Design an enzyme around this catalytic site. Structure first.
Site, PDB file in Angstrom:
ATOM      1  N   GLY A  59       0.836  -1.194   0.000  1.00  0.00           N
ATOM      2  CA  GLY A  59       0.000   0.000   0.000  1.00  0.00           C
ATOM      3  C   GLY A  59       0.871   1.244   0.000  1.00  0.00           C
ATOM      4  O   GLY A  59       1.867   1.310   0.726  1.00  0.00           O
ATOM      5  N   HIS A 100       3.240  -5.477   3.170  1.00  0.00           N
ATOM      6  CA  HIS A 100       4.418  -4.620   3.238  1.00  0.00           C
ATOM      7  C   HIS A 100       4.200  -3.410   4.134  1.00  0.00           C
ATOM      8  O   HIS A 100       4.834  -2.366   3.926  1.00  0.00           O
ATOM      9  CB  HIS A 100       4.825  -4.166   1.836  1.00  0.00           C
ATOM     10  N   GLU A 135       5.450   1.357   6.040  1.00  0.00           N
ATOM     11  CA  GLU A 135       5.601   2.734   5.570  1.00  0.00           C
ATOM     12  C   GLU A 135       4.912   3.686   6.550  1.00  0.00           C
ATOM     13  O   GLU A 135       3.919   4.346   6.239  1.00  0.00           O
ATOM     14  CB  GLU A 135       5.042   2.869   4.160  1.00  0.00           C
ATOM     15  N   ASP A 178      15.262  -8.119   2.050  1.00  0.00           N
ATOM     16  CA  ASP A 178      14.526  -7.223   1.163  1.00  0.00           C
ATOM     17  C   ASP A 178      15.057  -7.349  -0.258  1.00  0.00           C
ATOM     18  O   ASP A 178      14.666  -8.255  -0.999  1.00  0.00           O
ATOM     19  CB  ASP A 178      14.616  -5.772   1.644  1.00  0.00           C
TER      20      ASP A 178
END
Ligand SMILES: Nc1ncnc2c1ncn2[C@@H]1O[C@H](COP(=O)(O)OP(=O)(O)OP(=O)(O)O)[C@@H](O)[C@H]1O
Ligand SMILES: Nc1ncnc2c1ncn2[C@@H]1O[C@H](COP(=O)(O)OP(=O)(O)OP(=O)(O)O)[C@@H](O)[C@H]1O
Ligand SMILES: Nc1ncnc2c1ncn2[C@@H]1O[C@H](COP(=O)(O)OP(=O)(O)OP(=O)(O)O)[C@@H](O)[C@H]1O
Ligand SMILES: Nc1ncnc2c1ncn2[C@@H]1O[C@H](COP(=O)(O)OP(=O)(O)OP(=O)(O)O)[C@@H](O)[C@H]1O
Ligand SMILES: Nc1ncnc2c1ncn2[C@@H]1O[C@H](COP(=O)(O)OP(=O)(O)OP(=O)(O)O)[C@@H](O)[C@H]1O
Ligand SMILES: [Mg+2]
Ligand SMILES: [Mg+2]
Lengths: 592, 120, 240
Positions: free
Chosen positions: A412, A440, A443, A525
């Site tokens: 997102g 994910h 953020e 990652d």
RNA sequence: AAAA
């Protein structure tokens, strides 16, 4: 081998009776004794050169007499340990006897035998205390001399790399000491659930010294031990592996149609990489990998080469299981009849062929599963996420094959429009089919976003999610529902900034997550973009999370195994293999 | 292959497109509907070919058990990607069910449905 | 009080937690479910005490009229507060209902649910999500009926559940009605599920610990004590 | 400090 080691004091006649211990004689004998003149080497010599096939040697510690001082004892212990390590047979544990001498050096020899191994620790005694050679000769002929064996000892399988890394030290003084065992002994318990958090139950059968070497804080010098460990990577993007360097060069070279590729573009470099001193924005981080990926992996040859190189890097890092994230739609094009499905099939076929080839040759192989990334609002119409979900669902039904698609991945952008609360109708099918869901959400997302990811999407893993401390209820619900979190120390350190990041005070919460019981995992990652594989990613925790221990590293590996999207039978097999391999390495990695 | 080889010799050929049947079973494993819908969605992406997937079929028992009013959520993605929807209405097709299939499932073709004259 | 006075004299004590049953009556007063949910949420706030409320139970007749497809609006708040949910899906538990309980109701542990063998997808979801099943051997044997009860060839699925990976816990349901305590409930598995081993019983105990509604620190302490006691009793049994 |  078949070697005696003995301590000679005032009475040197212990060496022959120790020699006669087995009913077939030995091959080599070495005796360590103090520097006092009371001990007579002539008696041992006259007993010994009558058997030329037996090599005999005497070592004397200079500057030590009667060992009546603490400094005397510590110097004698250091010298005796070095002498034991030097006379350590290469493959087989030796025999050792400690009947002669005072309690001090006898106990020192017993401790040395425990520390460096000893095939048999035994004692010799006689009723008449023989002095002349014919005395114990008659004693053994009659049978008065008895051999006392309190039990076999296996020793600690590997502590002899100190011999490799420390020199012979023929010329020594009161300065060159190695308090490497005393420090571990002191830090054993000088500091609740840490004792019961024991993963891989075969760790219990480890030597106690090894068990508490595992309890010592992790240090940057444990690189060899970290590398030799079988590890698990659950957040590894396929594209961000060969971003720059030689790997990118050979990936470009192996293109099927090199004319269309853009070899001109190069990514900007940040000084101090991978230990950057300045925070980097997420879009800048993504642009750092623009050399590789969608604009380059369109052709089949580049994709195959990248997959092969990624598997080679994984197996070279001793990673025994990985879950590679890929976005097949990003490498698909209708120009040459290359849909997303055939790209995903190419990736799967390459991975399964590599794994089968490595397994047939009975080599170490990394079982690799794939996650289909489902980006939201990426290329315009929102049909892309539905197409990705359908592609993952259909890719599951392959069934036969080593590498298989196990779950999907979500991302997102900022908040609200793409967090977690709109596509439950889409994800009802993905949950019915059997796919797993990863988010994910790292953020700087609101705790409501993580809550919706946990409950609305039923996500089984969370990407990054470094801000769980501010929401204790979120921590409680993550721990209670056994929802693992995947954090990449290098990527999180570079993007967000954690101490010792200059002009930064925030600390890495991985240690606090482990203490609270979160099923935390360490990942990479993007290997190429971050410039750090799994081994150094685990190693950097010695600075990101000061005070972390080797038990915490093994617990991280165990959590990675537990939270991996695998079937129960395969998980049990992987756990058994990991336990055996971890016991094997921990036995033969405390050597240094 | 059949269509192409018929076209090569320049004779009469029947252009054929395919519809993936999303059958209703209700005897367990209801994820068959999701599997079929996803299979059709990723099969239409083939792009090339004289024969191609053009839509899905809502077969199965047309009773009240598995009518069209329950699975609009499944078919939102199907409509998004561009697959037409066909609904079987051979037996016990209540007018409300057909109306829901038309308006909630966005069906562009109804199977049988011989009782339309009862509902003007 | 009982637990504290047992701990004071330093003897064996049974830490107990409470589940507030969200019962159903349907003879009126349909607000009973909401009242029970609110009572459980408020009682969780007590904070202190060795015994505390840890979750709710969806007991009562599980007919399709009152399945888990409705009360998501009720249980959103109970999930927000931090109360686990246990579904009493004993009888007439269709796969759709158990699926809704797992996903819509976010049930962390199901009751009985002996008919997971016929549904493979439901078993795979239950295994992957790591949600325990509470099967009571004596209660299911008396009610449902399994071998070696005469004229009943149905096999108890506990052994298959353990083999597949289900986090199965053996319980009592009702000590009085069934007439058997937990020890006898575990013992009956010798003939109820032939071929089950003692290590499987230890696995059942471990699954019961893992699926219990307890905090991580308390779970670790309980696991340490259980390892200690199990080692002691096994050594005593093997030495005698 | 009962093979110093
Ligand atoms: N940290 C991230 N935040 C958001 N999206 C990400 C992130 N990392 C990867 N992605 C997703 O991966 C893709 C970005 O990389 P790209 O499209 O070039 O191919 P890749 O295989 O996923 O990785 P790469 O090509 O960089 O090796 C996008 O779909 C993006 O949504
Ligand atoms: N990368 C790996 N390398 C070696 N073994 C692995 C690897 N990954 C998984 N394993 C485990 O090793 C076994 C693979 O070989 P196989 O399934 O035939 O059993 P095995 O040969 O008896 O065990 P092993 O290979 O360890 O000797 C499995 O148990 C598997 O879980
Ligand atoms: N079964 C069919 N047989 C012949 N033509 C068909 C058939 N189905 C479709 N067509 C159409 O006829 C054309 C096939 O032949 P072509 O493209 O060479 O044009 P054409 O020869 O002028 O038309 P025709 O084949 O009818 O004489 C196409 O436009 C095609 O769409
Ligand atoms: N959840 C618990 N945590 C700690 N101790 C418990 C717990 N439950 C019971 N006990 C008691 O602790 C003991 C079980 O563990 P163990 O036999 O090893 O004794 P202990 O470790 O010395 O006690 P403690 O764990 O309280 O320090 C029993 O006396 C038991 O009554
Ligand atoms: N198999 C079940 N299904 C649903 N609810 C049940 C079941 N067994 C017990 N209960 C619950 O127990 C209660 C039914 O009996 P009651 O209300 O009188 O209290 P009880 O002491 O728990 O049981 P009883 O007194 O009947 O032996 C209700 O709360 C009911 O929800
Ligand atoms: Mg990522
Ligand atoms: Mg009950």
């Amino acid at each position: 081998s078949r070697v005696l080691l003995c301590s000679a004091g005032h009475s040197s006649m212990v060496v022959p009776e120790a020699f006669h211990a087995v009913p077939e004689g030995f091959e080599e004998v070495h005796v360590f004794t103090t520097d006092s003149e009371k001990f007579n080497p002539v008696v041992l010599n006259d007993f010994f050169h009558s058997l030329p096939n037996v090599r005999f040697s005497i070592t004397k510690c200079h500057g030590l007499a009667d060992i009546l001082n603490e400094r005397d004892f510590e110097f004698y212990q250091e010298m005796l340990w070095q002498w034991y390590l030097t006379k350590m047979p290469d493959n087989e544990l030796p025999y050792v006897c400690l009947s002669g001498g005072i309690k001090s050096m006898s106990a020192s020899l017993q401790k040395a035998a425990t520390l460096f191994g000893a095939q048999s620790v035994f004692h010799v005694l006689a009723d008449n205390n023989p002095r002349n050679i014919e005395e114990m000769f008659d004693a053994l002929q009659k049978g008065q001399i008895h051999f006392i064996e309190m039990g076999y000892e296996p020793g600690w399988a590997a502590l002899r790399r100190l011999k490799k890394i420390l020199p012979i030290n023929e010329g020594c003084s009161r300065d060159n000491f190695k308090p490497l065992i005393s420090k571990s002994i002191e830090e054993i318990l000088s500091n609740t659930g840490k004792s019961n958090q024991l993963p891989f139950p075969s760790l219990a059968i480890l030597p106690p010294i090894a068990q508490q070497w595992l309890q010592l804080p992790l240090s940057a010098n444990d690189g060899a031990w970290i590398q030799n460990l079988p590890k698990v990577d659950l957040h590894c993007h396929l594209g961000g592996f060969a971003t720059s360097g030689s790997l990118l060069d050979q990936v470009r070279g192996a293109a099927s149609e090199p004319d269309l590729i853009d070899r001109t573009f190069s990514p900007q470099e940040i000084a101090g990489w991978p230990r950057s001193h300045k925070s980097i924005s997420l879009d800048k981080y993504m642009e750092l990998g623009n050399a590789n990926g969608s604009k380059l992996l369109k052709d089949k040859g580049c994709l195959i080469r990248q997959v092969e190189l990624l598997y080679q890097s994984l197996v070279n890092d001793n990673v025994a299981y990985a879950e590679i994230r890929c976005s097949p739609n990003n490498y698909a094009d209708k120009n040459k009849n290359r849909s997303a499905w055939v790209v995903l099939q190419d990736i799967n076929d390459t991975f399964t062929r590599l794994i089968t080839e490595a397994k047939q040759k009975n080599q170490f192989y990394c079982h690799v599963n794939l996650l289909v990334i489902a980006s939201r609002k990426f290329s315009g119409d929102l049909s892309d996420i539905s197409k990705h979900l359908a592609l993952a669902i259909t890719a599951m039904q392959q069934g036969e094959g080593v590498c298989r698609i196990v779950g999907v991945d979500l991302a997102g952008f900022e908040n609200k429009e793409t967090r977690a609360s709109y596509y439950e109708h889409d994800f009802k099918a993905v949950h019915r089919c059997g796919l797993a869901v990863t988010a994910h959400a790292g953020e700087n997302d609101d705790p409501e976003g993580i809550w919706q990811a946990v409950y609305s999407l039923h996500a089984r893993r969370l990407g990054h999610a470094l801000n769980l401390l501010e929401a204790p209820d979120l921590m409680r619900t993550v721990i209670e529902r056994k929802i693992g979190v995947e954090m990449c120390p290098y990527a999180n350190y570079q993007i967000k900034g954690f101490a010792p990041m200059p002009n930064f005070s925030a600390l890495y919460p991985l240690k606090k997550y482990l203490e609270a019981g979160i099923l935390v995992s360490v990942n990479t990652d993007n290997i190429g973009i971050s410039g750090a594989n799994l081994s150094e990613n685990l190693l950097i925790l010695a600075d990101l999370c000061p005070g972390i221990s080797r038990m915490d590293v093994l617990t991280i590996i165990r959590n990675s195994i537990e939270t991996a999207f695998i079937s129960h039978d395969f998980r049990m097999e992987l756990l058994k293999f990991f336990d055996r391999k971890i016991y094997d390495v921990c036995l033969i990695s405390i050597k240094n």
